[PDB]
Amino acid sequence: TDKERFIASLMARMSNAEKIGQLRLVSVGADHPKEALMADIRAGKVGAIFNTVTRPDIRAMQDQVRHSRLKIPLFHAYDVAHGHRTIFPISLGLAASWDPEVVARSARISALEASADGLDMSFSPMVDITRDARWGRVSEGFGEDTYLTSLLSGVMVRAYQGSNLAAPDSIMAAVKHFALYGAAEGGRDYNTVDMSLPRMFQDYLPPYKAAVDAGAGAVMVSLNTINGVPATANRWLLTDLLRQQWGFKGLTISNHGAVKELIKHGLAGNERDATRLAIQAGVDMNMNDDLYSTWLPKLLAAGEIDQADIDRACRDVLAAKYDLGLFADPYRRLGKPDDPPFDTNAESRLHRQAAREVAREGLVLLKNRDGLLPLKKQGRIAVIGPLAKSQRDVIGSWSAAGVPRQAVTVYQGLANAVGERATLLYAKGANVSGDQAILDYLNSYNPEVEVDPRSAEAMLEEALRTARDADLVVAVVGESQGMAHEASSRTDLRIPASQRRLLKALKATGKPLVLVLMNGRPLSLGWEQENADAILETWFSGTEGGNAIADVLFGEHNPSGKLTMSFPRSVGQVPVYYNHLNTGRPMDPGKYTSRYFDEANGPLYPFGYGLSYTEFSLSPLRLSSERLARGATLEARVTLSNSGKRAGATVVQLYLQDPVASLSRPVKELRGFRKVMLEPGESREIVFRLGEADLKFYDSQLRHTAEPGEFKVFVGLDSAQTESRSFTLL
Amino acid sequence: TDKERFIASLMARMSNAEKIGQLRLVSVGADHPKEALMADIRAGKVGAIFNTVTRPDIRAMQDQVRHSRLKIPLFHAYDVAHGHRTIFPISLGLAASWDPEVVARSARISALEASADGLDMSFSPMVDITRDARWGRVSEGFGEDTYLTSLLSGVMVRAYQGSNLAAPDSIMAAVKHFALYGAAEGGRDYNTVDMSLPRMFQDYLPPYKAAVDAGAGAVMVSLNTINGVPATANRWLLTDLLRQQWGFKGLTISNHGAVKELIKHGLAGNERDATRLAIQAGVDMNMNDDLYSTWLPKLLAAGEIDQADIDRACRDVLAAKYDLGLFADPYRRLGKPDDPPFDTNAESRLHRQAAREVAREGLVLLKNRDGLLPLKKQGRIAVIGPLAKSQRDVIGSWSAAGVPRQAVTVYQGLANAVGERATLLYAKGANVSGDQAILDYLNSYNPEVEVDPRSAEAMLEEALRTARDADLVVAVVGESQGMAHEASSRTDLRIPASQRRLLKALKATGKPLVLVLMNGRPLSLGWEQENADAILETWFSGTEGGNAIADVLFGEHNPSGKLTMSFPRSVGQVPVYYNHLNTGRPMDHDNPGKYTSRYFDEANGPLYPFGYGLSYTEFSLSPLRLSSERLARGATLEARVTLSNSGKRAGATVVQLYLQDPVASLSRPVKELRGFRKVMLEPGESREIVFRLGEADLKFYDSQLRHTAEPGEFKVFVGLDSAQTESRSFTLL
């Protein structure tokens, strides 16, 4: 209420011009040249900045505020998605850690680095559920599961915002993209989203609510339609749900041009009408298109909006700044006047230890025939493929202020790990794509892919010569990071054809073949699963990726990563996800079942899958009783043993099924997990606790209750290989 | 009504056992052996039969009724989807005619032939909208468009049912599959359907309502969940919507095992609870699983259902029989006991002229380089491909009582056309698939695909020898009919790999290459569009298919067919459909940037759009003109264009009218079909086409499901496909 008092006294002093100026969020560029923008800040016409990311540049902008009548400070934002300068694995790789503390650490270090550069806010976490592998932005989320993504949503917010949003090493989380953005039809970015309310409430909305309940300060509004209404114009979504039902008290931010794009969506015929729809829906802050500054005065004078629409939006911007500590000290993240200057990109400001330890936890072992991995540091290892020496790709998409030249390649990680104990032989083998039109797409803004001027044939002949001179081949293959970014949707989920030709040529040498995969989405890997001797999924593993990958390949780290998104056998099976409905004719096999005829059915690799260099055993599942009273707790116990020869971690997963309900419920739903590190011969009793809240679902009328009757409890080391027992809720 | 008096006096006579017996719909099979079924009919324990399809067999079952206490007659049903004995093209090929009179004729002939064999009812039309090419049952529908499918839904019902459902040449339409069955997730048959209510009401439900409004006697309930609730247990769908809102007064029928499958869906833990959910939801008649007969008495005695649940279901069955004329004469479709026996499959009982004329109208010319088609009846023509001599495939899936040995193959149609004037050389070239697992699937239950035992290589060498000895190659390729049927969902939309290898080898001969495509779904044809010299889409063209295809190839018929479903460039683009939303960042010719709604690794848009199809002549359209720039509510607007045949051959095309509502309370489609005209023109002929548009054309369901037309701009597009249009605008006041 100090905050409410402070904001009400400030707003009672402000003109409408000053209130509207708070709603303007801009980036320096063609549309807002630096000197003109500086003059607007001085006039009180700017509320905040994004994409200005160094302390002297931010401090210069904050200095301009002292010229405005009320000297209301700016906040500065950036897309710190999975690292600021030190780049962690992409979020899909962090999720595969199954370890909230690992994910927390990446977020904390991101906030530490971003706040050290003067940033107040990140447009993160991204908590959109993804069941469609074709979407470019699957790399930005935590996979297909509502429970896990909801958990990590809360973890990311708490880790960014810390104990106090006014702390100089805290940043505000702007959770995105509200809402349902990863359900785009056809996996085409920005495309139509259409879904029932029970699916929306049960599966898609809970991660956004988890962020709000963790106290997220901001929400970034999505670019897509929800059931015909763009999120930027959706009063039900942004007012009724987010504010009135969920109690969100923070700031809504539009995406770039989102208010103007209501004209392309066909909700508005002109910019004046687009502005009215966005502010009355509940969008507080207008990114870059400047429609609010242009049209809000005219709309109010015409009685087309209410003073309360402006007041709500302005209070939310001021409340964000208040919580960030900026009214107490606008320079709290910008140090002192005549602090000595520093190199923003100095090696001494990176966190390589943390990036290497985090990156180890996300690597997923998918195949390991006859214990080929871990490798011994000996002999001659051929390192082949267009991603082996790529610094640009290892840091991934949404690499923020990450510097490619600071990153450790797979080749360099292997060189560092073996030193003089083994000989590495390098050949590029193929370009990332053989299709010049795809290479031109990827290099269209910036040179992001090195195109070897040699023929495909010459590169292959060199790679075969290299393979013949080696004891075994480490093929580093998959996507370049520009294939799994905003607007980069794919119609094919395989490794690119140029690289598959290389893999088929390398297989024909008879040399043991280890695949190191880099990719930002599930890939179709049927040929690789049949033909490679071992397969390690490394996503894009970040600044220290090459070192983390070498640590796993040589057995310094026993792989512990597990998939959080199902890998389809082909793009033609989309969508595939573990928490699907049974249907009336489930596939076991019979012709008259829910299936395809022209390919094997089910995912190639299921949700929760990942191998180890050791063996684990689970004892029989035991429940604390066969009947559960309302308000009572059920315990599900299992003993995990390391029955192999190497220390390692696995993830014990708990799944629930509600086999008779008022709605058809999923064949199983994740409801808990434990990541457990065990030395050989160690045993751990795992105790899962379940209550009524774990058993609730949204019915056809969106009643959120648990119905009496049977529940099935499954425990295992993936979604496919479980044991189950039942109990009855009374 | 005297009908409601008649039905109430009969129900006042009936025990609950008699009422519940009316709800039982069964087929002869392992689960219902013939003699046990006969004994059940005599006991009053059977309401209707399906899959008994000859006059003597139907007459024998109707004869059993005379032994029951009340002698209530059976009705007999079958899946007469696109023909009974004379098989027309599959429905997706009939829709490509764009001609309600052509579609009416196929349905009229179907009903004539089915009723002549004693059948009272067809489980048809199938009116499920299909936007996902992977689904096996796309072959059974009319494509992706709500307006077109809705129009043809009503045409099919009226054509089956005629002036009087008691007429001996009428059958009852059981419209299917209610509802949303073609929206299955992943295009996997029987899979989850999840969609918003505005999409449901605007795009998916209207064809079922068109069938109800045309007076369809029955509705067949679908197998899928709708937003979590199986259709068979969905009281909102079958009672609130179908009965209370739409006023449907007819019979609801479950699908095979659908009541029992509520256990697998996880709505019921046992058969007793599944039975309760189905009858209370509004399912009147139980197909095959016999749960109603087993459980309704126990449910009623326990107060778990109401007498009114049984009474509703029984009244609906009796009302169907009344309308069919079966209480007036149970033998009205079965002639007289004295009639001489006849051959059910006699040539004189077929309608080959109608099948040949209908089949010609559905063929779509997709490519014709440098006027290769039409062919001259001369020289040496190689006829190559696993579908060239296939009688089983030409009649399609859901071929009812069609006899493959009566069908005309593409090879036979070409032989019939050229007689002695040209030499045909045949080679199979490849099997339908090179994947043994796919062959195993296609020959499971019934052996439907002939496997040439030779290597792929030997078959190719034989086809290359044949091609080298000819002036040109007619390659007859695509899917077998078992690839586009119930449960046959595909993950690849290309021609099968064994056949694409054949086409690549044939291309390399340098011989002109004509592709004749058979298929039950849109195919991915990027290589074919680049490399074939001509491509003719023939779907599965039916009993006279091979003759209709020869008529088009030799120029006796100028191809007039147009696509009613978008052809994707690849399965990785699914779904692709013409009436999509713009998004905030459209990719189109006018919006070509990186940061648009697109894929980066393939050309964008469909390979062939909705409404696409070529001709052996050229057409021109005059400028579009509207009767005014402002439309008052209550008034109608006219949109006029002149069509000319500016080429050298007589032919038809389809003039298509689309609407856009560019500013609305909901994001509306970039265009929506709102009228069309198929026009046959001699060379140099012109026709003024007048489209009428009213407020009814402009309405949509908003977020609150209000059915509104909002004042403001509408754009009217006219053209010969959905990609090649021009527009004019008006303002609704």
Ligand SMILES: O[C@@H]1[C@@H](O)[C@H](O[C@@H]2CO[C@@H](O)[C@H](O)[C@H]2O)OC[C@H]1O
């Ligand atoms: O937070 C992120 C936004 O910064 C991002 O905005 C994009 C920036 O580049 C522009 O050219 C694009 O047009 C624009 O959408 O969108 C994604 C969001 O996560």
Ligand SMILES: O[C@@H]1[C@@H](O)[C@H](O[C@@H]2CO[C@@H](O)[C@H](O)[C@H]2O)OC[C@H]1O
């Ligand atoms: O009208 C058609 C039904 O008769 C058809 O029923 C099928 C009969 O064969 C069984 O093996 C199938 O399991 C069953 O669904 O289904 C589709 C409907 O259109």
Ligand SMILES: [Mg+2]
């Ligand atoms: Mg239950």
Ligand SMILES: [Mg+2]
């Ligand atoms: Mg409008």
